[PDB]
Design a protein around this ligand. Structure first.
Ligand SMILES: NC(=O)c1ccc[n+]([C@@H]2O[C@H](COP(=O)([O-])OP(=O)(O)OC[C@H]3O[C@@H](n4cnc5c(N)ncnc54)[C@H](OP(=O)(O)O)[C@@H]3O)[C@@H](O)[C@H]2O)c1
Ligand SMILES: NC(=O)c1ccc[n+]([C@@H]2O[C@H](COP(=O)([O-])OP(=O)(O)OC[C@H]3O[C@@H](n4cnc5c(N)ncnc54)[C@H](OP(=O)(O)O)[C@@H]3O)[C@@H](O)[C@H]2O)c1
Ligand SMILES: O=C(O)/C=C/c1ccc(O)cc1
Ligand SMILES: O=C(O)/C=C/c1ccc(O)cc1
Lengths: 345, 336
């Protein structure tokens, strides 16, 4: 049997921002039986993610960026994290009808090899299959091992979270409230800042966009200053944190989404302050910690199921809407994690 | 005895680079008495240190202008009221920039010299507060393994020169930069750094590091900032540490420059950890007992530039920010 397999292709390399135009559409004919090779499986991608790593995987091969996760080949389908179901297998741990999450291409049917810190088993289908592109996935694992491991948190301390009503950020601020920390958020709209103050249980929050003096916002919110900072923004925002940070204060550099879309990268001036304040700027990728994903799930699935972690998503229908759904993420049109549903169950 | 005390004042605060004309000489008369009050000693300042933190203290910590400049130095006790010191033994710590001073010892500001079988100007530098920076910042905050590669900026001087000696003792590959070909030559001649360049001869600073490191940079010891950190962040390796000691590029400025390449920290999984030496003084008696076997042996060396008297001590602190100092800028106030 042959399958009518629609795909989303990248045209060529990005300079600046993404547009629906830097992407294109094709169809192929992938047959519904076995792959022979290494330890190969043909899946059917049901859900897919729009994660921001994808910008500096959409750009021209720089040695800096190409030491994270490589570069997209022009005119071949966009790789990304997303939930998938086995049609036919050539692996032992995966049998016909099993589910996985991992790095699949933006196509309806993918021909992947499973390796251990890339593709992961779904043993738990007691809770949304969509969430393995988020909370029970890689955005949620960033937030576990990132906040607990490199922010090195200790109770009562004051946390700042930027890009806080979105997948990694909304989880950090919850995992922080669960230590009885003072968490303040920052997000782009009022819709976004209201969820921070209600649903996600942060103590205060602002809209950075509607804030003139970058620094003065963080001075009002934190009278006593900041101890932890979960960095999802950069530039203008890190300069604001370094005059507002307390002594032996830590910074976890998760991302820097303001920069990704720039060719001419913004200046961070106030780095002088980390001698004066004995501060720790620490960067990480999730991939280094995917060995403790067994140890993540054992914690989070007790806590979601009991009403201690909350999570919103931004679901769009089909591959057709997946250009649209990766573009306005860089402009912030997503309210929480941007999922794009290729097929449901 | 009732001798005169020549002193170096600060007139008014500094806004840019320090000129010799923001400092002037005045004189008091000190009675070489069993002294003032609280847990006091009267001291004679033998040697003084021209340290680059002093520009931040010339800002609006902070110095009180019309009074002396405070800094580190080696001094002999003249008369005591502290239970530890007696007449004729040796202290290092925060003295004032005069001939004779009345400081009260606080244990981790001021420290007693026992080993006098070493050049004593070395206790302003190698065995002082630049030396404890180079032990603490390299062994703890740079977190080193063997074979791993170190870049040291302002390698010439004080901190930077013991860092690169302690790395090719661990078994690392060490590179350093300096601003003249006298200071670059010193790195291969005296201290035996694997490679070295002149950063002033590089228009091409990101390429300069690509050249010196085929392997990449695992460890940086940051003494400088700005453009040099922007260049080292391109050049880093995976799970690469940067130990932020100083920023002499920035101290000097009423501008204070921007570092554009901090996105590299997610990708190359970097630790930029800033420290203060004062926090590590509990580990001074462990440092002192490690390095003095090796200094005595001739294995750890040091280059100093010495200025003679309080006269040529503005000329010495001004000149530090340009880099007229070939190594550590010490001032001798008194000969033995
Ligand atoms: N370290 C890792 O390995 C790893 C893993 C996953 C994610 N990340 C990183 O962390 C960040 C995002 O978290 P996420 O994946 O959960 O996505 P997300 O937070 O769901 O969505 C991205 C957010 O981007 C914000 N934004 C867009 N342009 C902005 C700008 N110019 N300035 C400030 N904010 C802007 C938007 O907020 P607003 O609407 O609030 O402006 C939007 O909600 C990214 O930088 C990403 O690369 C890193
Ligand atoms: N606990 C701490 O964190 C702590 C403690 C002690 C010292 N420190 C810091 O570390 C530094 C002091 O010792 P050191 O090893 O640097 O040697 P130094 O000999 O005391 O300092 C002078 C050197 O500064 C360099 N320099 C001056 N202006 C510069 C500029 N415009 N751009 C780039 N480089 C410039 C020059 O070298 P070149 O021209 O040869 O490069 C010069 O030889 C200071 O930044 C100081 O504040 C920090
Ligand atoms: O920037 C950002 C990168 C995020 C990222 C997340 C998971 C990976 O496997 C690689 C990069
Ligand atoms: O910048 C830097 C300053 C470092 C510093 C170290 C020890 C002191 O006593 C004062 C400043």
């Amino acid at each position: 049997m042959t399958a009518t397999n629609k795909q989303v292709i990248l045209k060529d390399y990005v300079s600046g921002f993404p547009t629906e135009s830097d992407f294109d559409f094709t169809t192929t004919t992938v047959e519904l039986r076995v792959p022979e090779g290494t330890n190969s499986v043909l899946v059917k991608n049901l859900y897919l993610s729009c994660d921001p790593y994808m910008r500096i995987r959409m750009g021209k091969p720089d040695p800096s960026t190409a030491a994270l996760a490589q570069a997209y080949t022009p005119g071949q389908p966009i790789q990304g994290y997303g939930v998938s179901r086995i049609i036919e297998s050539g692996h032992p741990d995966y049998k016909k009808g099993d589910l996985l999450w991992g790095i699949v291409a933006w196509e309806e049917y993918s021909v992947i090899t499973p390796m251990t810190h890339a593709h992961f088993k779904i043993q738990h289908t007691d809770v949304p299959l969509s969430y393995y592109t988020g909370l029970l996935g890689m955005p949620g694992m960033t937030a576990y091992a990132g906040f607990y491991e490199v922010c090195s948190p200790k109770e009562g301390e004051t946390v700042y979270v930027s890009a806080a009503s979105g997948a990694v950020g909304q989880l950090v601020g919850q995992l922080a409230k669960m230590m009885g920390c003072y968490v303040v958020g920052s997000a782009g709209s009022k819709e976004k800042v209201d969820l921070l103050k209600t649903k996600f249980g942060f103590d205060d929050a602002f809209n950075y966009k509607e804030e003139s003096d970058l620094t003065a916002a963080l001075k009002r919110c934190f009278p006593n200053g900041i101890d932890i900072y979960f960095e999802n923004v950069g530039g203008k925002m890190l300069d604001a944190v370094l005059v507002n940070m307390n002594m032996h204060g830590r910074i976890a550099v998760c991302g820097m989404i303001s920069q990704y879309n720039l060719e001419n990268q913004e200046g961070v001036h106030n780095l002088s302050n980390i001698i004066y304040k004995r501060n720790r700027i620490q960067g990480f990728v999730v991939s280094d910690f995917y060995d403790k994903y067994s140890k993540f799930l054992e914690f989070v699935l007790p806590h979601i199921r009991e009403g201690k972690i909350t999570y919103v998503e931004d679901v769009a229908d089909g591959l057709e809407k997946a250009p649209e759904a990766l573009v306005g993420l860089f402009h912030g049109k997503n309210v929480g994690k941007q999922v794009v549903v290729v097929a449901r169950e």
